[PDB]
Ligand binder design. Sequence first.
Ligand SMILES: Nc1ccn([C@@H]2O[C@H](COP(=O)(O)O)[C@@H](O)[C@H]2O)c(=O)n1
Ligand SMILES: Nc1ccn([C@@H]2O[C@H](COP(=O)(O)O)[C@@H](O)[C@H]2O)c(=O)n1
Lengths: 124, 124
Amino acid sequence: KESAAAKFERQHMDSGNSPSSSSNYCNLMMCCRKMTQGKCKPVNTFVHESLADVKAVCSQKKVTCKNGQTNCYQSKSTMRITDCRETGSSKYPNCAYKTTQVEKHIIVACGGKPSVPVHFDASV
Amino acid sequence: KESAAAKFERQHMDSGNSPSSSSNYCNLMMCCRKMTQGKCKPVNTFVHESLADVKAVCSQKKVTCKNGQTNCYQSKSTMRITDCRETGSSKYPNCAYKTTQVEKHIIVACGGKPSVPVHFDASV
Ligand SMILES: Nc1ccn([C@@H]2O[C@H](COP(=O)(O)O)[C@@H](O)[C@H]2O)c(=O)n1
Ligand SMILES: Nc1ccn([C@@H]2O[C@H](COP(=O)(O)O)[C@@H](O)[C@H]2O)c(=O)n1
């Protein structure tokens, strides 16, 4: 059971960060979206275009998947995305990320019916 | 089980024009620090001062807690804090917060041995 002291630190303490930072985004979002539990997910991309635009990639250019499956698609246009990479200093449970704002084409794996993105493969 | 489509949205989608904006700090932090599960916590303060300074409040100005308990203390000096309050548009499970950076005195409840902050009572 979480201690009251620890609960206060969780709910109320942010000693180590600036609320006006633009580069703390990955640290917060990787935490928010549950990719820092058990271990730090080493690499993750967030896409800032509309969900409709991202879903539409599944109808765009067929390309090779990094894993050799044949269900990957590349966006016809570059998209606004954020690249999150673990830092050299990052050590679970203190997961630290470098945030990079990028405009690149995304490659996603699509699946399901309707065919929708199910995995983020690469940005190129 | 979380659907593949949902997993992609959780891991990879953050649609919007200014995702890393300082205005989004409360949205990200409230999510990361687990105050948006079940319902949106309406009001929450994050403190940007050293934990040493916040612990030191437990030996500062005694004040009655808002709820009538008698283990509250007010900081002698103001502290840099961020006030998170639900917007008029916020509705679970889409919690939305206005982020406001202010410098105010904090009032905390102190408990345990050693006596440390266990509850955030108010900012004044
Ligand atoms: N550019 C990249 C590369 C990988 N990833 C994420 O990392 C996961 C595994 O990637 P790797 O197989 O390349 O290590 C992918 O499913 C994806 O969620 C990403 O989000 N952006
Ligand atoms: N200024 C404030 C007011 C309330 N709160 C949080 O909201 C809870 C309830 O506050 P109220 O008593 O004002 O409704 C407190 O336990 C505290 O966690 C806060 O963090 N900062």
